[PDB]
Amino acid sequence: EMEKEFEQIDKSGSWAAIYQDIRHEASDFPSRVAKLPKNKNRNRYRDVSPFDHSRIKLHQEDNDYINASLIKMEEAQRSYILTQGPLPNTVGHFWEMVWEQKSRGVVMLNRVMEKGSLKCAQYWPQKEEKEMIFEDTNLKLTLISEDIKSYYTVRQLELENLTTQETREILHFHYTTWPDFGVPESPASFLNFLFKVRESGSLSPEHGPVVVHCSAGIGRSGTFCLADTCLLLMDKRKDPSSVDIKKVLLEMRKFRMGLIQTADQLRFSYLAVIEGAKFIM
Ligand SMILES: Oc1ccc(CNCc2cccs2)cc1
């Protein structure tokens, strides 16, 4: 049982040690498309790249590249697209990806500005009457409604394909209270947020995979997917304590590098799953 594993690692202060063994054991696959000189300006960070085998391709003939990965969790029957916070020049590619993959939800785990720098382009409209048009990808995005709560904001958006005049409703889930440094003290509001995403139908197999991002698409984004998958496997299995969070993280790391950026994010992921298991058992 992970709860006893938690106390052992905590009492021995072994988090940095566990974390390094995960780093050591993590998969390494080629990222040749990401490294092509012409894709430099499509990448936020030079050391955060999608693997070629799991990368999302845009259906545009010129350049199919976006910094996004498909994470397929076969036993849990859950998929996720993890991506970076869009750049000023990739906002149109972002929405094209949402469209092409039939996603119903976008999960954002960062503020546009943190530590006095921009972590992400403002890629959705701030007012109903001021819609956004992405001329490069022929999409229009309208804010329909915005529900602001203490720890998160939910937005209903309308995405229109200007080429075919089809429209879809997209839900934007914006977790607004992740602190600038470290991790939340309590996983309560994060779990509350994760259950709200689940309740929306955004994680359901009827729809395309949910799009999840922070700034790099590996740290906070990693914590979200890791907690969701671990809780789902505990519902599914004959023995819920067969779930090993380290094995699940390593399976997820076959699809995108660097998921869970610090030993504190790892400790927080354990705390979230342990606390979430109480509300599921
Ligand atoms: O216009 C832009 C200029 C640079 C960047 C960041 N690129 C980071 C790097 C990726 C690969 C090698 S260096 C984004 C937009």
Numbering used by the authors: 2 to 282
What's the paper's own text on this?
Using these high-resolution datasets, we identified low-occupancy protein fragment-binding events using the PanDDA algorithm and manual inspection and modeling. In both RT fragment screens, we observe that fewer fragments bind, and on average more weakly (with lower occupancy). However, many fragments that bind at RT do so with a variety of temperature-dependent differences, including unique binding poses, changes in solvation, totally new binding sites, and even distinct protein allosteric conformational responses to ligand binding.
